[PDB]
Design a protein around this ligand. Structure first.
Ligand SMILES: [Mg+2]
Ligand SMILES: [Mg+2]
Ligand SMILES: [Mg+2]
Ligand SMILES: [Mg+2]
Ligand SMILES: [Mg+2]
Ligand SMILES: [Mg+2]
Ligand SMILES: [Mg+2]
Ligand SMILES: [Mg+2]
Ligand SMILES: [Mg+2]
Ligand SMILES: [Mg+2]
Ligand SMILES: [Mg+2]
Ligand SMILES: [Mg+2]
Ligand SMILES: [Mg+2]
Ligand SMILES: [Mg+2]
Ligand SMILES: [Mg+2]
Ligand SMILES: [Mg+2]
Ligand SMILES: [Mg+2]
Ligand SMILES: [Mg+2]
Ligand SMILES: [Mg+2]
Ligand SMILES: [Mg+2]
Ligand SMILES: [Mg+2]
Ligand SMILES: [Mg+2]
Ligand SMILES: [Mg+2]
Ligand SMILES: [Mg+2]
Ligand SMILES: [Mg+2]
Ligand SMILES: [Mg+2]
Ligand SMILES: [Mg+2]
Ligand SMILES: [Mg+2]
Ligand SMILES: [Mg+2]
Ligand SMILES: [Mg+2]
Ligand SMILES: [Mg+2]
Ligand SMILES: [Mg+2]
Ligand SMILES: [Mg+2]
Ligand SMILES: [Mg+2]
Ligand SMILES: [Mg+2]
Ligand SMILES: [Mg+2]
Ligand SMILES: [Mg+2]
Ligand SMILES: [Mg+2]
Ligand SMILES: [Mg+2]
Ligand SMILES: [Mg+2]
Ligand SMILES: [Mg+2]
Ligand SMILES: [Mg+2]
Ligand SMILES: [Mg+2]
Ligand SMILES: [Mg+2]
Ligand SMILES: [Mg+2]
Lengths: 154, 122, 129, 80, 205
RNA sequence: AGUUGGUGGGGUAAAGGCCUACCAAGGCGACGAUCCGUAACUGGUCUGAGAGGAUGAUCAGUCACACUGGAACUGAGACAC
RNA sequence: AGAAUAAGCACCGGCUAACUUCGUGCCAGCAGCCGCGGUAAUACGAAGGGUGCAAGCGUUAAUCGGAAUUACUGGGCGUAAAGCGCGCGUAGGUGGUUCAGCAAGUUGGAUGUGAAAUCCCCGGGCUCAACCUGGGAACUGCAUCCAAAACUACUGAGCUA
RNA sequence: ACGAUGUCGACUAGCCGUUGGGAUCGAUCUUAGUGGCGCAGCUAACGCGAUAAGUCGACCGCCUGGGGAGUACGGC
């Protein structure tokens, strides 16, 4: 899929005899709005090259998630490092109540009513990691029915 | 903390102290100037800031800032002071309200001339 | 010092299921037997048996389906330090109904579904998903 | 029937009067753990027949002294 | 109060049609609606997410000519109700009396429809109404007073509406200048370019 | 130290150390007595997704006061705006 | 009868929607925080031009939120703040397994109460709204009965991990 | 006063030494200590890893930005 959103651009620097050497880091996400999504990060000397590298990285390792019509299955909590993330399904009129990186990931991933929140450190990379961990591990019904029939489990 | 530890002594909130001890819960107060002068700011910035020592009806003697390019305050002037911290100056915690009792506002002010008590050009 | 042996049951199951074992054995108890019967009837374990000879041993065999375990998150709710009790309309719902909550009521140990249908509350032992 | 309380006799030095301790378990409003509280009552024992440590029951009447408005009805069990 | 002054400057800023004139000739050949007002018109001007929400909210507000306090009142009352408050806002904002006068063909622009309503010329059910906020009930019969029934302004508005598409959720008897409002329009009956959930996200911060 | 309880008596519209003469040494307290500072209380109000946090303008229920400190009279009712 | 009688306030470096020029020259000054001003200042003061509100607009004082920053819901303690120098033990907290009983916690129901207004739901009346008002829900609590017995408590009898 | 790591109990791949001691046929098994590596898992990272800082339960002590200061006053 092709729906590009740019999450972060940052300027980093290393030291050599003589002075500084500056580089740029770009964090982006790529998806189609129908379930598939992935994220990528890229380093370069200038911003456009970093963004292009990040986009190419995101097109690789793009994953598929199971969603119940623009909304999640169940409330869930996930984490990465010192970042924590909580999401739960919402009704149709609700927008995307989420901040910064979470909003980008969820807009690209195809959900539309998510009512999400995050705790701890809000480093965009770690938050996107936590959101992918949360979305990747959702189960959807008739899959938790890996034991027996449907509607007897529910 | 274990539940028993919280039952024996529960978590407590430490109430925050005000940064304007004078003018107790009052939006602004009336006072009289005792000494108007100039002072120098901290290292990065550099200027000659104009401030006034004020004795308030509470009995507190404090120091207030005089904003705007010009002022007509003198010793024994009666002023109205409001809150507001001046970062550049140590100890100045209040501001003088322009054009309120004896400060007369600023002149030749055309942009945002309500913070400095200037009448409309008309 | 064995303050709470049902938590020991749940932790044994969790650890052995995390180590890709196929049999878990522990000292037996009637409450443990009831919880294991609920787990089997719900389909989270394959089978369980109870031994004999004065010091009975409870044995459980586990399910995996895919290369992952079946029980991916089980937790103890009413520990002997809090003792949670709930009414019918307040019985917690696990994963929006895709999991189960084990409840002890005057009509036995059941799930949140069965208690909600029977209109009876009780003590929330553990949650499973 | 008549509303009745039960407790243990912790003092009988007063003449024709005993002190009864009554337990109760109250849930914490916020932390939800049941904590153990106690109440002390002065009870009118007309026959002076109650020793310390007994388990007795009492009922409410009109005051017979200041801070004394309960009278015992029977001795449930006697401390050995 | 009301917004007054240049009624095309808003269209130039927003970047879309934003019907605010008679629509006789065109919009592009009146105001060159391709540069934002002011000295700086050719700047690319990438704007952050907050800018996007603000533009969408300002766009709908300027379409319907509603001030901020009233708009937030509508939003809160729509959030009170059930069923996708995001489109409840549009449903309610589409039932205003001046807007209904607009969509029956009695006024070429919302401003003159509001002029007609505020000047005691429309009877909702035989009773005069002179306020541009009366939420029209479903099944009402909007009419024009006899004294003003023979103005040229209404006639001109009528043939101007003659080529505007047809809303089809109201029906007008043109000979006697009578109108009837059957029901509030469905979401699909409106223009499918405005995304209302963006506004709901804006006020939820 | 009328301090906790008991007995005879007094007193109140009414139970009662409420008062009194004797009798016993009791009574309360780390589940915070006593003391210090502050403060009318509630239905409620403002915030918050909620759990909570802050608060007691208007309106309604109760309490207390009437220049300051005391006391009683009349009356069904006051220790009297 | 006659468009005649009736728009202002704040802001424009980032957070935060909205930019160019002229005058100053670490001065005059600005500032909620990062900070700005020493010769091309979108940060000072003025202009044009915009941006947000609107009979209001800003500043000040105070409360909660954001703050998961007192963390019950919902945090931590090797090195960032944080394990008593180490035992023994009082009050307190917690308690292996089986049988039976009880009915305090627990669960379900009924009755009394939880003033009226207020908040909430469905209506009605003011040209609409604010406002007024009918009925219900709610007041998550307490007390008194009835029923159940899985878990905790209590009583009795056991067993050895 | 240090393992800068509270006490008690239960589970979770292995390999190589060593101290006190049992069983089976030098080897194997087993038990209470004491060390070096290391899979899962955990951690901001360093690193921990059956002598957990992993997975759990019972109770206790303590923390809430840096200075002023573990100081002043009062008590013992
Ligand atoms: Mg942080
Ligand atoms: Mg301030
Ligand atoms: Mg007597
Ligand atoms: Mg009395
Ligand atoms: Mg108004
Ligand atoms: Mg005496
Ligand atoms: Mg007497
Ligand atoms: Mg007072
Ligand atoms: Mg909150
Ligand atoms: Mg109070
Ligand atoms: Mg008053
Ligand atoms: Mg009152
Ligand atoms: Mg006076
Ligand atoms: Mg007096
Ligand atoms: Mg009399
Ligand atoms: Mg009186
Ligand atoms: Mg901007
Ligand atoms: Mg300024
Ligand atoms: Mg210049
Ligand atoms: Mg300027
Ligand atoms: Mg403030
Ligand atoms: Mg705050
Ligand atoms: Mg909080
Ligand atoms: Mg906690
Ligand atoms: Mg912390
Ligand atoms: Mg130690
Ligand atoms: Mg000691
Ligand atoms: Mg010991
Ligand atoms: Mg000990
Ligand atoms: Mg003990
Ligand atoms: Mg015990
Ligand atoms: Mg039993
Ligand atoms: Mg009940
Ligand atoms: Mg009520
Ligand atoms: Mg029974
Ligand atoms: Mg040493
Ligand atoms: Mg130490
Ligand atoms: Mg440890
Ligand atoms: Mg251990
Ligand atoms: Mg190692
Ligand atoms: Mg750690
Ligand atoms: Mg400090
Ligand atoms: Mg010292
Ligand atoms: Mg020392
Ligand atoms: Mg000392």
């Amino acid at each position: 899929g092709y729906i590009e959103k740019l999450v972060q651009v940052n300027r980093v620097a290393k030291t050599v005899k003589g002075g500084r050497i500056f580089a740029f880091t770009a964090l982006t996400v790529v998806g189609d709005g129908k379930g598939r999504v992935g994220f990528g990060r890229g380093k370069a000397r200038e911003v456009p090259a970093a963004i292009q590298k990040a986009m190419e990285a995101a097109r690789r390792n793009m994953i598929q998630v199971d969603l119940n019509g623009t909304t999640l299955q169940y409330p869930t909590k996930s984490a990465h490092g010192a970042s924590k993330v909580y999401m739960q399904p919402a009704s149709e009129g609700t927008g995307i109540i989420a901040g910064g990186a979470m909003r980008a990931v969820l807009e690209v991933a195809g959900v539309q009513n998510v009512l999400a929140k995050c705790y701890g450190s809000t480093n965009p990379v770690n938050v996107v990691y936590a959101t992918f961990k949360g979305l990747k591990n959702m189960q959807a019904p008739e899959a938790v029915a890996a034991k027996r029939g449907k509607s007897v489990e529910e | 903390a274990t539940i028993n530890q919280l039952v024996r002594k529960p978590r407590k909130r430490m109430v925050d102290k005000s940064d304007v001890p004078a003018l107790q819960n009052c939006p602004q107060r009336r006072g009289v100037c005792t000494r108007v002068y100039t002072t120098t700011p901290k290292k990065p910035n550099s200027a000659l800031r104009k401030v006034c020592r004020v004795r308030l009806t509470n009995g507190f003697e404090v120091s207030s800032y005089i904003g705007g390019e010009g002022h007509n305050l003198q010793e024994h002037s009666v002023v109205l002071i409001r809150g507001g911290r001046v970062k550049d100056l140590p100890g100045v915690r209040y501001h003088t309200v322009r054009g309120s009792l004896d400060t007369s506002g600023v002149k030749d002010r055309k942009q945002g001339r309500s913070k400095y008590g200037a009448k409309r050009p008309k | 010092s064995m303050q709470d042996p049902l938590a020991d049951m749940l932790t044994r199951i969790r650890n052995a299921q995390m180590a890709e074992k196929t049999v878990v054995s522990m000292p037996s108890s009637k409450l443990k037997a009831a919880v294991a019967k609920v787990l089997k009837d719900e389909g989270y374990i394959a089978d369980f048996q109870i031994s004999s000879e004065v010091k009975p041993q409870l044995s459980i065999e586990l399910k995996y389906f895919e290369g992952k375990p079946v029980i991916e998150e089980v937790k103890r709710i009413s520990r002997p330090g809090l003792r949670q009790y709930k009414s019918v309309e307040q019985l917690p719902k696990v994963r929006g109904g895709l999991g189960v909550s084990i409840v002890s009521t005057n009509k036995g140990v059941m799930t949140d579904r069965a208690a909600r249908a029977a209109g009876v509350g009780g003590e929330v032992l553990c949650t499973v998903f | 029937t008549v509303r009745t309380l039960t407790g243990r006799v912790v003092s009988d030095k007063m003449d024709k009067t005993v002190t009864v301790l009554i337990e109760r378990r109250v849930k914490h409003p916020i932390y939800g753990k049941y904590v153990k509280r106690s109440t002390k009552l002065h009870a009118h024992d007309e026959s002076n027949q109650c020793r310390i440590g007994d388990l007795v029951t009492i009922r409410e009447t009109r005051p017979l002294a200041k801070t004394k408005a309960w009278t015992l009805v029977d001795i449930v069990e006697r401390a050995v | 109060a009301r917004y007054i002054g240049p009624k095309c400057k808003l269209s130039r800023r927003e970047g879309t049609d934003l019907f605010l004139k008679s629509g006789a000739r065109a919009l592009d050949s009146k105001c060159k609606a391709e540069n934002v007002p002011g000295q700086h018109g050719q700047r690319r001007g990438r704007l952050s997410d907050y800018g996007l929400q603000l533009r969408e909210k300002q766009k709908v507000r300027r379409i319907y000519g509603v001030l901020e306090r009233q708009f937030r009142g509508y939003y809160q009352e729509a959030s009170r109700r059930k069923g996708s408050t995001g489109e409840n806002l549009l449903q309610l904002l589409e039932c205003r009396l001046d807007n209904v006068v607009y969509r029956m063909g009695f006024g070429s622009t919302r401003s003159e429809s509001r002029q007609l309503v505020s000047h005691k010329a429309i009877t909702v059910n035989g009773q005069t109404v002179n306020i541009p906020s009366y939420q029209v009930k479903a099944g009402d019969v909007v009419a024009v007073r006899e004294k003003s029934k023979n103005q040229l302004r209404i006639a001109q508005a009528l043939e101007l509406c003659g080529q505007r598409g047809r809303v089809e959720w109201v029906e007008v008897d043109l000979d006697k200048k009578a109108g009837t409002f059957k029901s509030a329009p469905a979401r699909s009956d409106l223009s499918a370019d405005i995304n209302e959930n963006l506004i709901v996200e804006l006020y939820s911060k």
